Amino acid sequence: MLSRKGIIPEEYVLTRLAEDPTEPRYRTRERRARFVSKKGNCNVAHKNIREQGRFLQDVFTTLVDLKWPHTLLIFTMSFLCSWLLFAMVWWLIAFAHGDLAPGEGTNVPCVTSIHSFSSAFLFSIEVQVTIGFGGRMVTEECPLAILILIVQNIVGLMINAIMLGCIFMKTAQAHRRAETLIFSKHAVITLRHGRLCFMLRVGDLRKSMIISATIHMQVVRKTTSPEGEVVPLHQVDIPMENGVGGNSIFLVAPLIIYHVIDSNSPLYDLAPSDLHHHQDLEIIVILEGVVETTGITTQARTSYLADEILWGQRFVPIVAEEDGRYSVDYSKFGNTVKVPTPLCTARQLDEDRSLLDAL
Amino acid sequence: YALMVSNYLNWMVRNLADMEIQLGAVKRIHALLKTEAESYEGLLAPSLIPKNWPDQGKIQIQNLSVRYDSSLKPVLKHVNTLISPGQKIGICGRTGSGKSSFSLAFFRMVDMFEGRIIIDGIDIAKLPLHTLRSRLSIILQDPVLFSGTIRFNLDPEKKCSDSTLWEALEIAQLKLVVKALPGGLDAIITEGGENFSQGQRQLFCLARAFVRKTSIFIMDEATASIDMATENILQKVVMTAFADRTVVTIAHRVHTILSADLVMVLKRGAILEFDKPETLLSQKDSVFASFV
Amino acid sequence: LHQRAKIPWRACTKYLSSAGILLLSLLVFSQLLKHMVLVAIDYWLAKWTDSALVLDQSVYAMVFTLLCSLGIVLCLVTSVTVEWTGLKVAKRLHRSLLNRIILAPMRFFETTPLGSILNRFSSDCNTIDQHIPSTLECLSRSTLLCVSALTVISYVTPVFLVALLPLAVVCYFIQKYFRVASR
């Protein structure tokens, strides 16, 4: 008790004055907040969510979502709680009926060969699992046993039905197939057909096709309107520059996913110097589609921070016809090679072409 | 004892935290003690290398390379100048390069990279800083008086009596204040003279300079003074010249730094012009333009 | 990296060294001997009561009286030693600080703020001259009482130490987190 009660008096004549703050550098502490991680896992922590039981009402969506070890615990506990609950009922009706006390030859017990609680629990196992080892029957002496037998059978069948359904929805999970969809770590920019385009590569490792594979693309950016609006994450959609203007894609070998930059694209004022680490860009990419083996739709997600773009590079060819079949070499999948490019905003490229045409 | 364990673990942890937060206040004190410099190492014979005391005032600066951190900006570059005995060379350099740093470093308070700061032809670069810094009077632009007795404020070490100290103080200036002074030469200066005067402060500085019996007196112009107070300071300068015969004043007041003996300009860290007579500076064109 | 600023011997040794050896030895010896006497008087009370349940009893009272007197005397000696050692350490630190600050370059005063020097002079010396002695005595008494209490508990029941080590681990974790936050 150095100052348990003696700290009440205050001198109020202290000589304390200004001192050096020695505050830590803000650059090291501040790290770019990624909207989504490299492999899905959207890093958007929610806050102040009002809970009205919505998360616990849909118990079956919750059960399928949980990890297998937790599902195994719930599987085991549901069966074991029902087994123990009906074991209590069976033991107590026997002890109420007075059939484990006497051992009298003329008394007919309502549940044959009940001698303890272990026998009652084994009888509960047999009824609900439907084994019926025969040594513990149900006689006709007390109709309450028949009613409990009906209730136990119906409860066991309901529980088995529900757990079967949850297991079937957990085997038809297609979240581990979206981890075989592969996106290049870093995307490039290069003039294809005289038009500056944001390229990318996506590949599939499994031999099973993905049907109706749809690629979306968004540019997350803090956009302010002329009318004072300050949108925190104004998700702007991006055309995929397909041959029919759609988002469809047919993926067997790795493909290039390029987006031509024009006056309508938000990336129309990108400068190679403006593409540094502390920059407000994140190019979300969404690869949807239904898996052919289960018929379950999936998403594969990735993000491309500004520092994850490499200006003026192109992807190495990956497919070669070494044999009668086509050969894809995933070793070079990431590899990129530099290529000459106008190191200036894409707007200055259209202006140059326009000025040259006029001149 | 099992019962009383509950209020012994608590006290152990709490007093450990208090001791840590308080031992921080010993770490900071030892941090201040980790600043070692200013060694009084006189590598000479302190009584036999110089005479009894330097008093001639023929200290000629010879190739004084001045530095403070010796990092990026030297000021002086081989000042080969001589102040003749009695020749009160009042020279004010360029206000931006060598105005105040020159006077400040004149007391060996800066890093002399090379050369030799001569004192009447003696090597003052290896002189006892305790004794050498006492027999060279100076004044500063921002006056300040330590509170205490008038004798204590003026000359505590010398402890000159009324016949010497009071006579010199009264004659120099503030005769009316001396009569007004309730005690006289031993009256306590209240809080450093918070309501005594402003120009009399510099007057007492020159009086205290005359009390050390130091021939030299390096002066500097006041930050602010009244026109009547400027005339009073001018009379004090005239009295100092007529009494000590030596001074070196670098006055920032350009319109009042003209009446002197010699002029020296230190522009862009170099001695662009030197003129032992005053009329040689006023005769040129560039030096005249910078001096007017 | 700098969060663990607790100095077990980095700064504590400096305070003790400033006091001196002739005073540190006396202070440590007095505290240890006073607590040993407190353990001894508690143990003697237990034995005397045990021998009085199955019933030389006057000799028990004589020893008990002559152990309480030694305890009181040791308490006074320990109190005086702690206060005197603190005073000497504070005096020596203040003298050394003034002497060093006198012999410093003008560049130091020009560079370092006047507020820094003035603060760490006045406020820090007051803390080390009126608050550290009392806190050191309180800390010493608390930790030595705690070690004494656990030793007595283990002596009465040897089984206790078996479960002391897991419990002590929990205690250690609590201490660590509190200090890091409390600072």
Query: Contact at 8 Å (CB) between A227 and A221?
Result: no
Annotated binding site of B for ATP: 197
**CB neighbour burial string for A136-151, b if at least 16 within 10 angstroms, e if fewer:** bebeeebeebeebeee
A28 to A24, A44, B2: CA distances (angstroms): 8, 21, 49
Identify the helix (H) or strand (E) that includes residue A188.
strand A187-192
For chains A and C, CB pairs below 8 A equal 24
Query: Which residues in A lie closer than 8 A to residue C139 (C-beta atoms)?
Result: 2
DSSP string, A50-65: PPSSHHHH-HHHHHHH
Looking up tokens 């509950």, which residue turns up?
B6
B106 to chain C, minimum CA–CA distance in Å? 13
Look up residue C102 and give its DSSP letter.
H
Rounded Cα distance between A3 and A112, Å, is: 75
C129 to chain A, minimum CA–CA distance in Å? 14
Residue A214 in marked binding region = no
The residue among C116, C121, C139 with the most chain A CBs within 10 A of its CB, best to mutate, is C116
Residue A214 has which token pair? 């749809």
Query: Contact at 8 Å (CB) between A152 and A128?
Result: yes
**Residues shown for chain C:** 183
- Residue B174 Rama label (left phi>0; alpha psi -120 to 50; beta): left
Residue B139, burial from CB neighbour count under 10 angstroms (0-12, 13-18, 19+): buried
Looking up tokens 């007051």, which residue turns up?
C126
- Out of A2, A14, A16, the one facing C134 most closely (by C-beta) is A2
Q: Which residues contact A62 (CB under 8 A, 6 or more apart)?
A: A55, A56
Query: Which residues in C lie closer than 8 A to residue B16 (C-beta atoms)?
Result: 139, 143, 175, 179
Residue B248 has which token pair? 């070196």
Q: Which residue of A has its CA nearest to C125?
A: A15
**Long-range CB contacts for residues A330-336, cutoff 8 Å, separation at least 24:** A330/A182, A330/A203, A330/A205, A330/A254, A333/A182, A333/A184, A333/A201, A333/A203, A333/A254, A334/A184, A334/A185, A334/A186, A336/A186, A336/A188, A336/A310
Residue A294 has which token pair? 């289960």
- Out of C10, C120, C139, the one facing B16 most closely (by C-beta) is C139
Annotated binding site of B: 95-96, 98-101, 197
- Of B200, B212, B198, the residue nearest B165 (C-alpha): B212
Rounded Cα distance between A66 and A101, Å, is: 47
Please answer yes or no on whether C11 and B109 come within 8 Å at the CB atom: no
Query: Which residues in C lie closer than 8 A to residue A19 (C-beta atoms)?
Result: 115-116, 119
Look up residue A307 and give its DSSP letter.
G
Query: Contact at 8 Å (CB) between A176 and A39?
Result: no
Read off the amino acid at residue B1: Y
Residue B282, burial from CB neighbour count under 10 angstroms (0-12, 13-18, 19+): middle
For chains B and C, CB pairs below 8 A equal 118
* Technique that determined the structure: cryo-EM
Q: Check if A17 contacts C (Cβ < 8 Å).
A: yes
B162 to A118, A141, B15, B150, B155: CA distances (angstroms): 117, 133, 59, 11, 12
Looking up tokens 């370092």, which residue turns up?
C112
Rounded Cα distance between A180 and B268, Å, is: 71
Query: Which residues in B lie closer than 8 A to residue C40 (C-beta atoms)?
Result: none
- Sign for the CA dihedral angle at C127, C128, C130, C136 comes to positive
Looking up tokens 């999936």, which residue turns up?
A298
Which stretches of chain C are assigned E, i.e. beta strand? none
Rounded Cα distance between A140 and A137, Å, is: 10
- Of A288, A279, A265, the residue nearest A308 (C-alpha): A279
B26 to chain A, minimum CA–CA distance in Å? 16
Residue B174, burial from CB neighbour count under 10 angstroms (0-12, 13-18, 19+): buried
* Strand partners of residue A230: A224
HSE value, Cβ hemisphere, 13 Å, CA-based, for B183: 10
- Out of C10, C127, C174, the one facing B25 most closely (by C-beta) is C127
A98 to A84, A140, B178: CA distances (angstroms): 21, 15, 124
Residue A172 has which token pair? 């038809």
Query: Contact at 8 Å (CB) between B60 and B82?
Result: yes
- Sign for the CA dihedral angle at C109, C112, C114, C120 comes to negative
- Of B168, B225, B236, the residue nearest B198 (C-alpha): B225
Residue B102 has which token pair? 């020159």
Question: What is the 3-state secondary structure of chain B?
Answer: CCHHHHHHHHHHHHHHHHHHHHHHHHHHHHHHHCCCCCCCCCCCCCCCCCCCCCCCCCCCEECCCEECCCCCCCCCCCCECCCCCCCCCCCCCCCCCCCHHHHHHCCCCCEECCCEEEECCEEHHHCCHHHHCCCCEECCCCCCCCCEEHHHHHCCCCCCCHHHHHHHHHHHCCHHHHHHCCCCCCCEEHHHCCCCCCHHHHHHHHHHHHHCCCCCEEECCCCCCCHHHHHHHHHHHHHHHHHHCCCEECCCCHHHCCCCCCEEEECCCCEEEEECCHHHHHHCCHHHHHHC
Rounded Cα distance between A248 and A269, Å, is: 27
**CB neighbour burial string for A212-224, b if at least 16 within 10 angstroms, e if fewer:** ebbbebbbbbebe
In 3-state terms, what secondary structure has residue A334? coil
In 3-state terms, what secondary structure has residue A337? strand
Query: Contact at 8 Å (CB) between A63 and A77?
Result: no
B202 to chain C, minimum CA–CA distance in Å? 22
Q: Which residue of A has its CA nearest to B16?
A: A2
- Out of A1, A2, A15, the one facing C119 most closely (by C-beta) is A15
Rounded Cα distance between A113 and A136, Å, is: 6
Rounded Cα distance between C134 and C82, Å, is: 8
Rounded Cα distance between A132 and B251, Å, is: 117
CB atoms within 10 A of CB A233: 13
Please answer yes or no on whether B68 and C182 come within 8 Å at the CB atom: no
Rounded Cα distance between A315 and A256, Å, is: 9
A3 to chain B, minimum CA–CA distance in Å? 9
- Sign for the CA dihedral angle at B230, B231, B234, B239 comes to negative
Rounded Cα distance between A304 and A184, Å, is: 10
Query: Which residues in A lie closer than 8 A to residue B15 (C-beta atoms)?
Result: 2
Chains touching B, CB cut-off 8 Å, 3+ pairs: A, C
Query: Contact at 8 Å (CB) between C89 and C19?
Result: yes
Q: Which residue of C has its CA nearest to A1?
A: C138
Please answer yes or no on whether B15 and C138 come within 8 Å at the CB atom: yes
- Residue A134 Rama label (left phi>0; alpha psi -120 to 50; beta): left
Residue B234 has which token pair? 């001018």
Rounded Cα distance between A145 and A91, Å, is: 11
Q: Check if A20 contacts C (Cβ < 8 Å).
A: yes
Q: Which residue of A has its CA nearest to B11?
A: A1
Q: Check if B26 contacts C (Cβ < 8 Å).
A: yes
Residue A330 in marked binding region = yes
Domain with residue A113: its CATH number is 1.10.287.70
Identify the helix (H) or strand (E) that includes residue A338.
strand A336-338
Query: Contact at 8 Å (CB) between A328 and A319?
Result: yes
Cα dihedral B122→B124→B128→B132 (10° resolution): 90
Identify the helix (H) or strand (E) that includes residue C87.
helix C57-102
A302 to A39, A97, B224: CA distances (angstroms): 6, 67, 70
Resolution (A): 3.6
Q: Check if C143 contacts A (Cβ < 8 Å).
A: no
For chains A and B, CB pairs below 8 A equal 5
- Sign for the CA dihedral angle at B185, B190, B192, B193 comes to negative
Please answer yes or no on whether B18 and A1 come within 8 Å at the CB atom: no
Residue B209 has which token pair? 């300079």
A214 to A290, A301, A325: CA distances (angstroms): 9, 12, 27
Query: Contact at 8 Å (CB) between B83 and B59?
Result: yes
- Sign for the CA dihedral angle at A15, A17, A20, A23 comes to positive
- Residue A194 Rama label (left phi>0; alpha psi -120 to 50; beta): left
Chains touching A, CB cut-off 8 Å, 3+ pairs: B, C
Please answer yes or no on whether A15 and C113 come within 8 Å at the CB atom: no
Query: Which residues in C lie closer than 8 A to residue A14 (C-beta atoms)?
Result: 123
Identify the helix (H) or strand (E) that includes residue A320.
strand A319-320
Query: Contact at 8 Å (CB) between A282 and A304?
Result: yes
Give Rg (Cα) of chain B. 25
Read off the amino acid at residue A139: T
Query: Contact at 8 Å (CB) between B273 and B281?
Result: yes
Tell me which residues of chain B, numbers 29 to 48, contact chain C at a CB-CB cutoff of 8 Å.
29-33, 35-40
Looking up tokens 């529900």, which residue turns up?
A162
Q: Which residue of B has its CA nearest to A2?
A: B15
CB atoms within 10 A of CB A121: 17
Give the orientation angle of helix C21-53 with respect to helix C132-156, to 10 degrees.
40
Look up residue A297 and give its DSSP letter.
B
Query: Which residues in A lie closer than 8 A to residue C138 (C-beta atoms)?
Result: 1-2
Residue C92, burial from CB neighbour count under 10 angstroms (0-12, 13-18, 19+): middle
Rounded Cα distance between A351 and B51, Å, is: 86
Rounded Cα distance between C143 and C161, Å, is: 18
Rounded Cα distance between C67 and C44, Å, is: 9
Provide the terminal-to-terminal Cα distance of chain A, rounded to the nearest Å: 90
Q: Which residue of A has its CA nearest to C115?
A: A17
DSSP string, A16-36: -------PPPHHHH-----SB
Query: Contact at 8 Å (CB) between A215 and A249?
Result: yes
A264 to A237, A239, A285, A311, C33: CA distances (angstroms): 11, 10, 19, 21, 87
Residue A41 in marked binding region = no
CB atoms within 10 A of CB C128: 23
Rounded Cα distance between C145 and C75, Å, is: 13
Query: Contact at 8 Å (CB) between A254 and A202?
Result: yes
Residue A27 has which token pair? 């650059």
Looking up tokens 């007095």, which residue turns up?
C30
φ/ψ (deg, to 5) at C46: -60, -50
Residue B215 has which token pair? 């021939």
Cα dihedral A309→A311→A313→A315 (10° resolution): 30
Residue C172, burial from CB neighbour count under 10 angstroms (0-12, 13-18, 19+): exposed
Q: How far is CA B243 from the centre of its chain?
A: 20
- The range of the structural domain enclosing residue A146 comes to 56-175
Tell me which residues of chain B, numbers 173 to 192, contact chain C at a CB-CB cutoff of 8 Å.
none
Q: Check if C130 contacts A (Cβ < 8 Å).
A: no
Query: Contact at 8 Å (CB) between A174 and A291?
Result: yes
